[model samples]
Target chain A: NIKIFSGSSHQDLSQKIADRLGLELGKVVTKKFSNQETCVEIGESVRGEDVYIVQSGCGEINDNLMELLIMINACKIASASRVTAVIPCFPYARQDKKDKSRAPISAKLVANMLSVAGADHIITMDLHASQIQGFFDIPVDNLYAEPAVLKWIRENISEWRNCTIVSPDAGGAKRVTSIADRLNVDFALIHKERDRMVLVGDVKDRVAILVDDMADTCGTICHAADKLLSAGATRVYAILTHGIFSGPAISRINNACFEAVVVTNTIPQEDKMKHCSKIQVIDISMILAEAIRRTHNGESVSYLF
Target chain B: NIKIFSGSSHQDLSQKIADRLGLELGKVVTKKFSNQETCVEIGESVRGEDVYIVQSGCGEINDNLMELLIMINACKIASASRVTAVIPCFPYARQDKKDKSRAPISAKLVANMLSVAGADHIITMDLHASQIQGFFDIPVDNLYAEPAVLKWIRENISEWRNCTIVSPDAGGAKRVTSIADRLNVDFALIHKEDRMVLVGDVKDRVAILVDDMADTCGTICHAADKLLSAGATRVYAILTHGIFSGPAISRINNACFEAVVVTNTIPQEDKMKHCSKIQVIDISMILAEAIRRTHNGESVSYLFSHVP
Candidate 1:
């Protein structure tokens, strides 16, 4: 039998994934003592069964990491055949490389910690850097969010031929281009001359579809839209996987020139419902659930895309 | 005498303020139980003394708010003369009004909670809405970050005559206008058309000085600078508090803008220090110390502007 557990980081996202899979979320009691040390106990039967833990490193990165490690270790101790860590948002992933000489590669360190903490297999979405997978000895499934985003765009847009995909910066060109390729659309990139100063190149007379993995404050999308307009882009829209709209993100998005914005339910959108103007949410729970089911069934999950 | 206590939420910022005031942070032993309930205990003597509990409503907002209430109740039980909350960042403050009916005014609710929990005075910086002060019956000091930023500009930037103060949005025009008036400089406004679009109305030629309360991912400031260039500005810069959130913050700040000017606290320089072209950190200990004095019986509140 297959089992699914959730960490404290993003229990809502995990529950959604389980619901999509037509299975109840595996029960787990995670308690914190007076000393702040976290303890985990598997509630349901998982003896000799494959287990998957869905968690994200959202807020309280340290505490969430501890909960994940403890849960993984507990499952390993419970004699589970395999324990897969389904971390949608990997922690310390920004420190994938040491830009400085003496600096530590913290992303690699986090990978090592998860590996040592008993994570047999790892699954994560859009890593800060693709090279981070090299840090772990275990099989890592770095899922691309483009398939879901592209499919949604194809179905939603009234005139798909008029839409032009846009990359906010140069580094995101590859990802945006691939998404553009999948959608059978042309792509443009926003170039920044200095801070807060940007210019859209030759996007005039086209509806812009700004693509990115995550949106922290909707600034990049907003700024890029302004550039697109300056360069004669008709209507600007955005589609991203994770919506980490922490501070003033809603207001900023509402005030921006974007005709609409699309985001996934990977990070939970309870706080974002207030500012629904020009924002559409694409629930990826069903897809994530199918992926989890396939992985647990000893089948390739890549076909879920 | 006055006593200052620190909460787990931004204790480092509280400690810096305490050090600036030449006072030790109040001893409060905090612990979490098996049920995740936070337990707070104030050590040493604080009876008959004015107590200021410092906390920021950042991450773990509920826990921090509860911790603050517990500390305040503890102070009240200890017979403190007065209890003041020095919240650098108030959580759920963005929802100050019911934009639509049925939506809760969370900021007002939080204000009521503090008052009910025995808070006599409330001091916070850069609230999402300035009108939140009216929510409290008690004395509220919604201090502006411009005075300190103005002083920093005077001391740092040699060519003050050519400086142009810019408001990141129309809402910030009043604050930035005052700073521009004080500095006797021309000002500009950056307006957002859409999510990724910005327009800077720079009629005259001058060095652009960007001002905002917070710079998350450095997006607004970046767009403002872009708009300024299109309208003809020599160079663009920014002065803001709460700089970059996580590691992704600095990448945007460095890659997008010229230099992000910010304060010492709020841990702004973590990834920012790597790129020399990205940020300029202003040691804001002086203002933090002044606020501490104002909280006490000391005379400093009246000296809000032009305080060295």
Candidate 2:
């Protein structure tokens, strides 16, 4: 049997993941002292049972990260058989590389902290850098949102023959090309400048579908949409896995001229979705639940794709 | 050449250490974002320099610890020849042992985090548990505030020959005995229960309370009141890590004690300046001498014997 727990970062998301697996959320209490020290108390016994903790790297990232570490430590102390961390959005993912001198590889440090906190395994989705998996000594199951994104598109966007997948930047070209090939549509790349974008491929009279791993502030997505429309694209839409719509993102999306901004429920976009009109959220709890079941059953999770 | 940097925890103490070494404090900017992420920027080049980052593990312990780790990582990536973490007051030192089942030895975890953050060595004062030094893979010079405390006692307390050193608890008996032996004075231990009871005789003799840290001053204040009521001539407190947090100053000032002496391991000058009962002793000279000797391949064991 498996036990599921939730950190304070995204408890509602954990409840959904638990419900999909036909289980109830494990009892755990996490609070902060007046001095800002994180205190974790596990409610029930996790001894000799497979325990999974669902915590995302969002909304007060430091507090959430500390809570996850303390929770994992608590479970290990409780003699849990195996503790798996389900971080939907990994913290410090952008700091994967040391871009400047004297800069810390914070993502690597986060990986080290997690490993030292006694995590047996990790389950996250669409990591900003896939190579981060190599940073951990334990097994990491990196699930992709591509299958779900494709299914949503096929159901919503009818007439997909004239659609072209566009990458927001050169770095995301591989992700866009894979989606384009799977859908059997044309692909394009956007060369971003200071204020505008230069289209690298033809998007004339084609439905432009911009793809990215995450969207923060929504500036690049909105600007790309404007550039695609000016470049003779019929309509513009964006597909982002993580919606970290921070500061003015709702206003930008509300003002932008896009058919729809499709995002997954990775980082809790309920508050943002309520403010923005163009956003359409898709549920990925079933995907995560299936991954958790396969992982516990010792079966191949690759079939999830 | 040595370049000393300071984090936000105890910059004044770092400056004093730097001044004693006759060098300017290393320029580094540490700030937090609106989202509370730590940011550090080294102002000058530390290429091929012996760098020491002085950050005590006090005052907003979590933020200070994170700042120290980021500073160490920054110095390592900046190509500093050596990066020594000069944490005078180590954080999470109390969580040194697994008292309960499944409890985390957080001190060991902190030690691991420091080593992974690229600290070549660590210099701290009067750890809560001496065994914490073994938790680190790097060379840890666990200095003591005994020499400074001893000097202050000799100079300030005229009747030292009649003073009896007392341990706040049974666990501190070894530390108190060591201090008492060095001073050639008698010692006592407080009863675990009802803290008012005394194990050794403190009748009509000045009681000197010796401890490693003073956080909130709750136990020390209560002990002082008990010791005075138990017919002790007077009470005095000497501690290393003076974490005078949350009404500690007010309590210390109002307690029935001659003086509450603490070393300058942490930044206590400004916060304790208003409290007349508290005495701050500067230990920057000792730290500077240790750094100098370590850099020159000299033994620091002599520092333990030589009280200045």
Candidate 3:
């Protein structure tokens, strides 16, 4: 009744989700021409099945995006009942707004591309901005990582009640406050002015945990950790939903004054964690699998939240 | 007024199109994230403006396709009056049919993606198959290189009267016969079970190998040697899209063809550099005039019957 497919983007996540859903990954063939134009062929009929294609937006992003689009279109044209694009880390999420004159709303374009390619629904995790959901005509379930982060904090920290939740900046203040309110703990905001930064809330002599949606180069996280420590924070841990860890991020986290940098497996972190002892990953695949289950059953997704 | 934008796929072709249309290229910004995701921003308001973007499917094909898609969406949201994709060489044309079970009709997917991205019209050159035009819900003008090919023969080849039009296979037999009828010359067919075989009449006559596109030039190269072996004095190739991927330049340079000619459906200045036998024909006038006539609501019937 339901078919799960994986694009070239993230097979490991796709496998973990499929294993939890008690289903095998669907058969698909993807190759390239001598000129590198992506070619796709569905290995079986999805004629009347609900298709869930798990493709993240990390590696070979452009090629993977096209791969997912082609797969979704193949299924749709072949008469698939419903096509759900399960993107763990939405590509071009950072480009959600026209921050400048004539700037492209790339995430919106991604939405249109998916919608046009016949994706009837979208399932993604912790969108960079709330406006992204509104960019689509189809229904979107922006699953959260807060519950997982909250669970991780309580179980891992011995004196979690005394720990302070810190945010990267005002941009992440809303997330920091939500987790802070849930834990009923103090909160700190890290503000920067290019070379200098100011800590708005007291992290002095507290276990400061910095929260964010993602860390690209870990520049802000490492700098924030140093600032928190300088402000008399006893220990600091960076918690993020997506650990992109590109460039010198892993080394930065390893060399920074951090107890542990907590992250989700939205992007693969096996190599990242192996390289940096300060990095810790929380498997949130079960939540993603639960969302897939509820969506397939036509049940409310709020229960997972 | 029409605003012409160019994707990063082929700027030289884009520039030529703008030059012929008596306008400068539209201002646009394209950047890439560290993750290699493309970013495109239209530098001017396209609100209520006719928009035409020229993007080919070659050269970093995936990135160019993504860039083209993003740029089109950008203009659509900006309220462009119309968006016409001037794809000289349509992407995925080779995958137009479901030749095998479960194979993707990628060309059809491309058409759907373009239509959904807000392209109201498509202008491409000779499609790989006849049905590529019907693949789209929008209007498509599949222009021909026959007129130009014929013209090149008349002006360039002095003894063009002593030429036999040749088809790579029976699939192109119709095209070869049509050209032969126009010139009132003999037509030949190269049947492959595979290569190293054919039925043709070319004795001391210049053989013109005709096709829609040249991807690897393997067929053209192989056919050139075959024609020579079959008693044809010399071989000439005329294809619309010169993709020239994968050892094509080396093959064409080392092969037995006098001069292989192709239209500017895709850029070829770089290929021309590496191969002495490669030559280019400018079809920007055809594209520009087509855009001009379409904007003016004039019949593009002239484009099909007449050379651009």
Candidate 4:
């Protein structure tokens, strides 16, 4: 049997995932003392049961991270058979490299914290950097939003055949091209300049579908959309796996010239979608539910992609 | 040259230490972005200079800890000669052991993070457990607040000859006896049996209660009440690390104690400013002296010698 719990970061998402798996959310009490010390107590016996914990990476990141750690520690102490940390949005994924002298590779440090917290496996989605998988010593299932996003596009977009996938920057070319290949569509790259974008492919009268892993502030994606429209694309759309939507992102998306700014429910976007009319949210709970079920059954999960 | 910087946790204590050392507080910008990600920028050149970062385990402990890690990482990248993390109050000190099965030895994990963050040496005061020192491969100077506490007691408390030291709990008997031995006073232990009860004598004597830390003041207040009921003339509680959290100030204010003395190890001034019974004994001078001695390659043991 499998038991699923959630930290305070994203209980709604966890409940949805648990519902998709046809299981009730595991009982856990996570609270903070008046002095701001995190307290966690497991409400029921988890002895020898496969335990999965769901905690995301936003909304008081430090407190969320601490709560996740404490929950993992509590589950391990309760004798959970296997604990898998299901962080939909991994914290510190951008600090994956020591880009400059004396810079800390914080992603690696977070990985160390998780390992020490006794996480046997990690299930995350659309890491900022793909190479972050190598940072963890344990098995990391880096799930993608591609299968879900592509399914949404094929069902929703009427001119899906005339769509040309575009990457916001050269770094995202790999992700964008993979989706383009699966859909048998032509792909283009937009190289980021000092202040503008330089498109590197033909887009005359074609539907432009921009793909990226995350969109924070939506400046780059918005700029890329403008550039794609200027290059004669019929319509502009953007797909981001993690919608951070920090400070004015909703306003920028509402003003941008895009058909829809699609993002997964990785980070909570209910408020953002209410404020921005041009945004659409796609649910990935079914995909996560399948991944969790397969992992517990010792079956292949790669086929879900 | 040596430079010291402070994270946002306790800049006042850091400034006091810098002043005691006859140096300006190192210029460093430590802020959080809108997303609450820690950002650190060393304002001046620390290249080839010994850098020390002062941060404690109080006030949003996790944020302060993360800032310390980021600052150390910044200094390491700046090619400092050495970077020492001067944490007056080490976080996760209570989790030094696996008390229950599968419980994380978080104290050791914190040590690993510090070492991984490129801290060359660590200077902390009166760890919850001394063995936490062994968690780090690097040399850790676990300084004591005994000398400062004793000095404060000698200078502040009258009727010193009539004082009888008492341990608030059995686990703190060693700490209480050490102070009792140095003061040449008789000591007693308060065993918690349903409620606190004294094991040794305190009747008609001035009772001085001692412990390493006071978080909620629940046990300390209970013991103080017990000491007063046992016919003690007055009660004084001295703790090395005054966590003073969660109704602690109110409890201390209401408790029947002449004064509750705590060190400046963790910043307690702002929180305890309204509590008349809470008296803070500054330990910045002691830490400054230790830093001086360590930097000069001299013995710090002399600082520990009781000067009665």
- In the order shown, what is each candidate's alpha-carbon RMSD? 24.1, 4.0, 2.9, 3.7
The complex in candidate 1 yields a DockQ of 0.01
Compared with the true structure, the alpha-carbon lDDT of candidate 1 equals 0.68
DockQ by candidate, in order: 0.01, 0.31, 0.58, 0.34
Question: Which candidate's lDDT is highest?
Answer: 3
Per-residue alpha-carbon lDDT of model 4 for B1-308, expressed as tens digits? 98888887567888898998899987776556456766566788889988888995457777777778878887887889999999888887876775644445667767877887789999888898899999999999988888887787788878666688899998788888898888988899998978776887798888988887888899999999999898899999998888888888889888998999988888877767678888888888777877777788788777776421
lDDT for each residue of candidate 3 in A143-209, tens digit (9 for 90 to 100): 9988889999999887689889999887888889989999999998988886688889978888999
Q: Tell me the spans in candidate 3 whose CA falls farther than 4 Å from its real position.
A: A56-58, A157-159, A191-199, A220-223, A248-252, B56-58, B191-197, B305-308
Candidate 2: residue B188 lDDT (0-100)? 92
Q: How many backbone clashes does candidate 2 have?
A: 0
Q: Write the per-residue lDDT of candidate 3 for residues B1-308, one digit (tens) a residue.
A: 89999988467888888899999999987777656678788989999999999895448777787788778888887889999998888888888877656776888878877887778899888888879998898999888877888898899988788799999766888889889889888889887775457787987888999888888878888988889988888899888888899988889989989899999887788788888888888888888888888889998878775886
All models: lDDT? 0.68, 0.83, 0.86, 0.83
Model with the higher DockQ, candidate 3 or 4: 3
TM-score of chain B of each: 0.83, 0.95, 0.96, 0.95
Model 1: what TM-score for its first chain?
0.90
Q: Write the per-residue lDDT of candidate 1 for residues B1-308, one digit (tens) a residue.
A: 87887887466677777787778887776655422334556776677887888874244455566567657766776678898888766655655654532233546656766775678988776566778899889988765566667776787666666667766666667876787788888676666665433333454444555554453545554554565555544455555455454443555544434455665535554445565545554434644665666655576554466444
Fnat by candidate, in order = 0.00, 0.25, 0.66, 0.26
* Best TM-score among the predictions, by candidate number: 3
Q: What number of backbone clashes does candidate 4 have, counting pairs of residues 3 or more apart or in separate chains?
A: 1
